[PDB]
Design a protein around this ligand. Structure first.
Ligand SMILES: *[C@H](O)[C@H](C[C@@H]1CCNC1=O)NC(=O)[C@@H]1[C@@H]2[C@H](CN1C(=O)N(c1ccc(Cl)cc1)c1ccc(Cl)cc1)C2(C)C
Ligand SMILES: *[C@H](O)[C@H](C[C@@H]1CCNC1=O)NC(=O)[C@@H]1[C@@H]2[C@H](CN1C(=O)N(c1ccc(Cl)cc1)c1ccc(Cl)cc1)C2(C)C
Lengths: 306, 306
């Protein structure tokens, strides 16, 4: 037993991480087969970053301007192209450590692991959720751009995020691996703002089930509620609406604990209207929303990755 | 910016993890050079685990009873010996993925990363602290024994923990890699209890500094206090005494923020006596104590590992 915010083992992604330097900008790239992917704002100077025309900036670049550094081995760049907000640097060596992989785009409310990197060297791994407002609450310092987010399915790495920038509230924005931003953000050094967030209701319910599985039961009650009457309460506390598909997805956790989904909704309703009154749930004094139903089932059942 | 509970990249440890099966018990082993380390209770049956005499049990074993499984390659065991509560299985192949490593024993209050494993396959990575009562609050299911805890220093893996058991409160107990238990626990299926815990005061102060660095300032005050008068408050709220060495260790964080350590103590005193009054610190509604001063400096500065 126990419940921890758990990242995927990072070894398969560590073997893909390289350093990309152009001019005075150094960031991280992702090396898969003979392509290195990295944020296109590597081609910018300090005054380029204010309102850049990236097509103009890129035509003025040469293959030899891009220094790609894989550990202590230099990778010769033999082609370059831009795809949306990422650069694809074609190199003369295929990465012998390339795992089986996919480029997937995730939905708000879904989670992934982030391998934070600096100078092509991995620094730490941690779990993130895509917020409803398409930001992530990460841990990123200067030089972290090009660090990626991912999930692992059995032996396959599904890359879903590449890091590009920090917003004024200290949250983070980036792209999928096709270079398309999550949310209404642009890779320009201009004033942008996250936009209002909401709490991921289905994830909070999943975490309440994790708690019950682990022996925290004090928030349970005999009461029940209808889905419509729960969603009236959710709206008022800035929670996302709960759909019948969310109820369906929570089915297995409901069956394992013997607590009906709508009964757990009644419990959540009381927690929202009363607070916790000095008690904790799974070591937290807040309702936690960055665990999906899948994350709960995985951890409270023990799936591995080969 | 941002602050996350961050684990070390796990790739170097992933390459050491193997499956050890003996009789009807399967658990994980750690393969370094030509030795596989694993909990000695792998040699036990169901009724052996109640009050085992491990010396007697081990003399009745043969090398061929131990099935060691490294991915899809079987490792032939050519010797076995017991060291305290771990078994050392000498195998006929040195692990070509053996990183540079050390066996270190950590202190309560220190943190490490855990690579949770099942059937020799890594499942997830997360950060733990050694509690003052020598337990850890982990996430461990059946078959997780032999999963290890570690820190990484530059290129060197310092292994500090091997997992052995869960206690009745749902916390976890294990050994260092010399097989010596952390705390007063034994690898017997008998009733044992954690013993009273305390909060790691120096770590809470480090986390308050992390918060300030990241722009949470509402808990700051003009007040100050003496070290002796702070420790009178710490005792009452079941916090560990703060020593002058703790004050010294917090020096760099104090200098970076411009907030004197004893001033931050006055802030902590007020938080203990008043609570938080509906506000949060770094996304938590509780005072968090599983970040060391080192963890804060590392993350709020950006050290990597090659
Ligand atoms: C790439 O390594 C870096 C990652 C940043 C650095 C700190 N945390 C991060 O996530 N990305 C950037 O520096 C991008 C890049 C230029 C500006 N930028 C950025 O993150 N910041 C920024 C955005 C808009 C404005 Cl008006 C000013 C700065 C930024 C915000 C906050 C902080 Cl503390 C640092 C940098 C591009 C081209 C947008
Ligand atoms: C090894 O894979 C396993 C890891 C356990 C399993 C669930 N969580 C864990 O950390 N370790 C054990 O099963 C050890 C092993 C026998 C008993 N044991 C153990 O963890 N449990 C236990 C300890 C004492 C008593 Cl009286 C009864 C059980 C245990 C506690 C709680 C739960 Cl939910 C499962 C198992 C050894 C030889 C102590």
């Amino acid at each position: 037993s126990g419940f921890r915010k758990m990242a995927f083992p990072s070894g398969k992604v560590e073997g893909c991480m390289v350093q990309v330097t152009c001019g005075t900008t150094t960031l991280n790239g992702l090396w898969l087969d003979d392509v290195v992917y990295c944020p296109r704002h590597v081609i910018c100077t300090s005054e380029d970053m204010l309102n850049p025309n990236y097509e103009d900036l890129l035509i003025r670049k040469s293959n030899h301007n891009f220094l790609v550094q894989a550990g202590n081995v230099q990778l010769r760049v033999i082609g370059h192209s831009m795809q949306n907000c990422v650069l694809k640097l074609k190199v003369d060596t295929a990465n012998p450590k390339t795992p089986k992989y996919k480029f997937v785009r995730i939905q708000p409310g879904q989670t992934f692991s982030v391998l934070a990197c600096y100078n092509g060297s991995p620094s730490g791994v941690y779990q993130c959720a895509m917020r409803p407002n398409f930001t992530i609450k990460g841990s990123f310092l200067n030089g972290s751009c090009g660090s990626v987010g991912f999930n692992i399915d059995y032996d396959c790495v599904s890359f879903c995020y590449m890091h590009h920038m920090e917003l004024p509230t200290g949250v983070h924005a980036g792209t999928d691996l096709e270079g398309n931003f999550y949310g209404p953000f642009v890779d320009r050094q201009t004033a942008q703002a996250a936009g209002t967030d909401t709490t991921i209701t289905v994830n909070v319910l999943a975490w309440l089930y994790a708690a019950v599985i682990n022996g925290d039961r004090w928030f349970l009650n005999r009461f029940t509620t209808t889905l419509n009457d729960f969603n009236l309460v959710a709206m008022k506390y800035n929670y996302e609406p709960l759909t019948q598909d969310h109820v369906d997805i929570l089915g297995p956790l409901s069956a394992q604990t013997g607590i009906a989904v709508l009964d757990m909704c009644a419990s959540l309703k009381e927690l929202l209207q009363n607070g916790m009154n000095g008690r904790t749930i799974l070591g937290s004094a807040l309702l936690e929303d960055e665990f999906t139903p899948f994350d709960v089932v995985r951890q409270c059942s023990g799936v591995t990755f080969q």
